[PDB]
Amino acid sequence: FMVSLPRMVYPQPKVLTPCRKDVLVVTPWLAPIVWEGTFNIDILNEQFRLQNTTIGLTVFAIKKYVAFLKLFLETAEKHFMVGHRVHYYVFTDQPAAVPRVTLGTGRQLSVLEVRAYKRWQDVSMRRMEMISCERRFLSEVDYLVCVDVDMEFRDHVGVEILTPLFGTLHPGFYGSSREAFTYERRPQSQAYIPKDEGDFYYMGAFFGGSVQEVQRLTRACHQAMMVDQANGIEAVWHDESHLNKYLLRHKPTKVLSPEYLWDQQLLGWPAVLRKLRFTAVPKNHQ
Ligand SMILES: O=c1ccn([C@@H]2O[C@H](COP(=O)(O)OP(=O)(O)O)[C@@H](O)[C@H]2O)c(=O)[nH]1
Numbered sequence: 221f222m223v224s225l226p227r228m229v230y231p232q233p234k235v236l237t238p239c240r241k242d243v244l245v246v247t248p249w250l251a252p253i254v255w256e257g258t259f260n261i262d263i264l265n266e267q268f269r270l271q272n273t274t275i276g277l278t279v280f281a282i283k284k285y286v287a288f289l290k291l292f293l294e295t296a297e298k299h300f301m302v303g304h305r306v307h308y309y310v311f312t313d314q315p316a317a318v319p320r321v322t323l324g325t326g327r328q329l330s331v332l333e334v335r336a337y338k339r340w341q342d343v344s345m346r347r348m349e350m351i352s353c354e355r356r357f358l359s360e361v362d363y364l365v366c367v368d369v370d371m372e373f374r375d376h377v378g379v380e381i382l383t384p385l386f387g388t389l390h391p392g393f394y395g396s397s398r399e400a401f402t403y404e405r406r407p408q409s410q411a412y413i414p415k416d417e418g419d420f421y422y423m424g425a426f427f428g429g430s431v432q433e434v435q436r437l438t439r440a441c442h443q444a445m446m447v448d449q450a451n452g453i454e455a456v457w458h459d460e461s462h463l464n465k466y467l468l469r470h471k472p473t474k475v476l477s478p479e480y481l482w483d484q485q486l487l488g489w490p491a492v493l494r495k496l497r498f499t500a501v502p503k504n505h506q
Pocket residue numbers: 279280281282283284285340343344367368369370425
């Protein structure tokens with residue numbers, strides 16, 4: 221049950237004036253595409269605080285990537301769901317290497333030890349299995365957000381992203397035609413998408429939704445990756461190829477713009493991005 225919003229004073233939306241004329245702000249299945257200037261964060265904050273919303277954030281920091289946790293977490297504290305209840309879940313093979321970061325009130329961090337895999341690809345790929353922790357998340361949070369660690373928050377990332385299921389536009393492909401997307405193109409893979417299908421190319425580094433929908437998504441991608449393994453095939457972009465196949469067949473209820481996943485070193489700061497909110501930290505491949 222949702223109680224009434226209080227009286228609020230804010231600018232009137234006018235239907236004969238668009239917030240943004242330069243970009244697509246709604247998908248053809250009527251999911252908002254979240255750009256700056258499309259949302260009044262004061263109204264959204266009210267709606268979500270009146271539900272005492274709790275957001276979980278998953279992050280894997282395996283092997284060398286524990287080095288990225290300090291900046292990731294400290295900048296999350298400045299910009300990620302400030303004012304709301306947050307539970308970080310840090311999955312790592314080195315619990316002792318997790319930095320001691322000071323958290324704002326209403327925020328908590330759990331360290332979950334997991335195995336390390338040798339291959340970069342398996343570390344990245346086995347996140348879906350590890351995420352799909354099912355019973356704990358259902359008891360502890362309302363939404364789950366699943367991100368890469370080799371990142372920093374530079375600006376607001378808040379409850380405008382929350383919805384039953386979201387993906388984020390990959391910053392290399394938002395202006396591309398579908399045939400240029402790097403979907404898995406071999407029909408022998410479960411992640412296969414033909415050249416005439418596809419709405420968007422979503423990046424594997426930022427997706428989320430309600431616990432139920434995120435558990436559906438990660439269970440389906442883990443099952444599909446097991447089928448591929450049994451068939452001796454590995455999708456071209458690993459878990460990201462399977463996330464794309466899932467989101468083509470189960471449309472997300474919001475899509476985040478590339479404000480939410482950017483690389484300023486490789487792509488600069490185009491005018492179409494009013495804010496750069498969550499960005500890659502430089503790293504050697506290797
Ligand atoms: O040795 C590794 C390799 C990958 N990852 C995790 O897998 C994610 C995706 O890998 P990566 O960031 O290397 O992929 P990229 O963004 O460079 O394509 C990383 O952010 C980490 O969360 C990790 O923890 N240790």
